[PDB]
Amino acid sequence: MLYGVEIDEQYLRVMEEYKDKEVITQADMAKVALQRKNVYQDQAEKRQAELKAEYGVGVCVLVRVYNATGGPITAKIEESFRGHFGAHTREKRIGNGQWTVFIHTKSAGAAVGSAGCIVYGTTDNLDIFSGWQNPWNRSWDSQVLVEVRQSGHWWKNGSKDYMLHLLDTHNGQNSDSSYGDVKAHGSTGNETTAYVEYVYSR
C-alpha cells in the first residue's frame, strides 16, 4: 500500500536546517523528500519482490512510485491498455516522502503483454502521466514513459490510442519529463517481469 512518513511542514520544522525559517517552501519539502528517498525504499522493493513471487512467470510490471514533489499527489486516472491491475486497490493519495507499490500484469493465459498507466495530480494543478509497456514478444524491449502536463491533459489533449502509440514506439528503459516546477522520471528493467520505478520531484 503506502510506505514512508509524509514529509510536510511539521516534519521540516523539527529539522535543524529549517526550524527557524520564516516560510518553509514546497521546494524545501521536496528537497528533503528527495534526500529521504532511500529510507523506506527497501520496504517498497520488498513489496515488489512479494508481488513478483506471488505472480510468478508471465509478463508484468512491479511498479514503485516515490513522491518527492513537496506536496501530496492524488491518483486521477488508471488505465489498462493491455492486461489488468492486481487485485489490491491502488492508493488514492501519496504524501510527499511516501511510496506506493502495485503490480500490473498481462491478461491471464494470453500471449499479450502488460501496458497501462496511472495519472497523478499535484496541488499546483499538474497531472503526471506514468505509463509502462512490457511486451510479450521479446524481439522488443520493456518501455516506460512519463509526461508532466497541465491538469486535465489526458485524455482530451492525449487520447488513449495516442498514449499507447507512444508506449509502443518508445525506445528507452528510462524516461524524463518536466513541466512548471515539477519533474518526473521513470525507469524499467528490460525483462518479462520487470521492476519499474517512477520518481516525481521539484
Between strands 114-121 and 93-94, the pairing is unpaired
| Dihedral-angle region of residue 92 (phi above 0 means left; psi in -120 to 50 means alpha; beta otherwise) | alpha
**The three-state (H, E, C) secondary structure of the chain, written as one string:** CEECCCCCHHHHHCCCCCCCCCCCCHHHHHHHHHHCCCCCHHHHHHHHHHHHHHHCCCCEEEEEEEEECCCCEEEEEEEEEECEECCCCCCCEECCCCEEEEEEECCCCCCCCEEEEEEEECCCCEEEEEEEEECCCCCCCCEEEEEEEECCHHHHCCCHHHHHHHHHHCCCCEEEEEECCEEEEEEECCCCEEEEEEEEEC
Contacts of 84 (CB under 8 A, 6+ apart): 104, 105, 107
CB 152 within 8 Å of CB 129: no
Tell me if the bond preceding 132 is cis, omega within 30° of 0. no
Domain CATH for 54: 2.60.270.20
Residue type, 107: S
Name the experiment that determined this structure: X-ray
CB 138 within 8 Å of CB 168: no
Structural resolution in Å: 1.5
Phi, psi of 169 (to 5 degrees): -100, 0
Query: What domain range includes position 143?
Result: 2-201
Phi, psi of 135 (to 5 degrees): -85, 150
Residue given cell 502536463 in the structure block: 149
Domain count, the chain: 1
User: Between the CA of residue 161 and those of 2, 82, 100, 105, 176, what are the distances in Å?
Assistant: 31, 12, 27, 19, 21
